[PDB]
Amino acid sequence: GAMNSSNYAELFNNDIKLFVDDTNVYRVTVHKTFEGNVATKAINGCIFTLNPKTGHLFLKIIHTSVWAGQKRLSQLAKWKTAEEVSALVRSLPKEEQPKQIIVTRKAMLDPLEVHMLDFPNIAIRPTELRLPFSAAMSIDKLSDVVMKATEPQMVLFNIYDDWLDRISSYTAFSRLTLLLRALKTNEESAKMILLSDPTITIKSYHLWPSFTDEQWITIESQMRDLILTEYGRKYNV
């Protein structure tokens, strides 16, 4: 059944699993037409498929061409997501295929279950957790590759850079969720905190700056402060 606070450690055991987030699959800007009616223009999207244990990110770029002449796009987006995740599982060798797929949004369960009928041994699971994977398009290098795509494209990343050389998955995932939670609450402040010191750079093959263990503690603290500050603004508490 559902992934929650109680069965959280399961994410870091040795059963291959993937999180699927469909939030950024169908993306529009709403604008006024000449006649003063409202219209949407789709921009490139992505499926966010993450192995929380290894940090392997399967970023499937959703080119605006997939929507051309299609109706009910918010509905189609869930089925196109399920179709791409299914095709990704099929493309992996057997011993690399997930035993579980956790969808961050319940509306993905039926589309994914129907596309995965060929895989009755892969459990499709919701989660009670409010994960901030929507903020994935606040990571500059992920946003850059999505907006520049001219066709459907799969791009492979490690969303933990080289962190697993020094910390456990559990800790890496907590760091990733704190970074994404901050970027989601206040992108400007979050990004300012990450690049405030020009001496700490992002390696060409990385997403995040090369912080020493002590600089991560300080960054992690600044991110928690940002989240509480913003919380005491939203709610005036």
Binding site: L76, W79, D110, P111, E113, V114, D118
Partner: protein, 300 residues
């Protein structure tokens, strides 16, 4: 008109014949039911006064032989049996009739209720859902599970309804996942109608049989089958016009006949609301929508 004689009534029991029912007292001189219309299936059903647990009954067609009921004090139930000796049977019946120890199947002449509930139900098809080929009649009770319920425990005592599963390879063509799940027309028309049932009549017969088993025995698996078969039609964008018009009539009589006090357990909120208000066919069940709205507005 045909007769189902009773050897005796040794235990107090509510006896049902189709939509009619009669209380019989322990050792009341009851010798059965006469004037049963030829041309339809019938069901004769029982609920012991001493244990309302286990409604149970026999589907039969009087054209297929001479049937009587006899209490078995070993198995503790009223059993249907076939009398192969035609002249012994006619002789037994003629005695009980002369002594007027038989209730009359109490059909009002204006009343097409039983025809309307059993229009497509065929005794030879019942015998394939309820397998016991040494008898021409079919035993059903409250607790019998469906083949599908057993998949998710004794196969001899199963209801072999046609398995319907919206999230099965059978229901969904590879490469038409979204289309086949959101519009089940493929599954209804090619798999179920052309493939398994051969025609709309056989499909309606099983639907009507599932309903009656749900209503007369409170059989939960039959209720699930009745809802599934309704939902597959209502969730199909493409259904022949004749099937839609017939479905509206079928369902009208089922909702009309349901005990008012059983709507809570026999009717599935999600299926009905979806079928009447959301589905492709939301506008094609005028009679059914009018009677449901006027008779069970709470459920909606």
């Amino acid at each position: 008109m045909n007769t189902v004689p009773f050897t005796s009534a040794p235990i107090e029991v509510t006896i049902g014949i189709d939509q009619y029912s009669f209380n019989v007292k322990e050792n009341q001189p009851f010798h059965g039911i006469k004037d049963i219309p030829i041309g339809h299936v019938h069901v004769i059903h029982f609920q012991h006064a001493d244990n309302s647990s286990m409604r149970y009954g026999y589907w039969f067609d009087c054209r297929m032989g001479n049937f009587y009921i006899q209490y078995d004090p070993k198995d503790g139930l009223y059993k249907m049996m076939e009398e192969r000796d035609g002249a012994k049977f006619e002789n037994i019946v003629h005695n009980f009739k002369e002594r007027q120890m038989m209730v009359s199947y109490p059909k009002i002449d204006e009343d097409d209720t039983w025809y309307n509930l059993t229009e497509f139900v065929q005794m030879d098809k019942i015998r394939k859902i309820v397998r016991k080929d040494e008898n021409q009649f079919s035993y059903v009770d409250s607790s019998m599970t469906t083949v599908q319920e057993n998949e998710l425990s004794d196969p001899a005592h199963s209801l072999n309804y046609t398995v319907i599963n919206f999230k099965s390879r059978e229901a969904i063509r590879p490469g038409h996942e979204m289309e086949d799940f959101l519009d089940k027309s493929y599954y209804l028309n090619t798999v179920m109608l052309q493939g398994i049932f051969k025609n709309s009549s056989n499909y309606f017969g099983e639907l009507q049989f599932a309903f009656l088993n749900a209503m007369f025995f409170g059989n939960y698996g039959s209720s699930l089958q009745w809802h599934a078969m309704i939902e597959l039609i209502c969730s199909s964008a493409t259904v022949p016009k004749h099937m839609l018009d017939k479905l509206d009539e079928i369902l009208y009589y089922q909702i009309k006949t349901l005990p008012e006090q059983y709507s809570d357990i026999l009717l599935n909120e999600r299926v009905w609301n979806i079928c009447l208000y959301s589905s492709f066919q939301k506008n094609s069940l005028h009679n059914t929508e009018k009677i449901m709205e006027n008779k069970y507005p709470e459920l909606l």
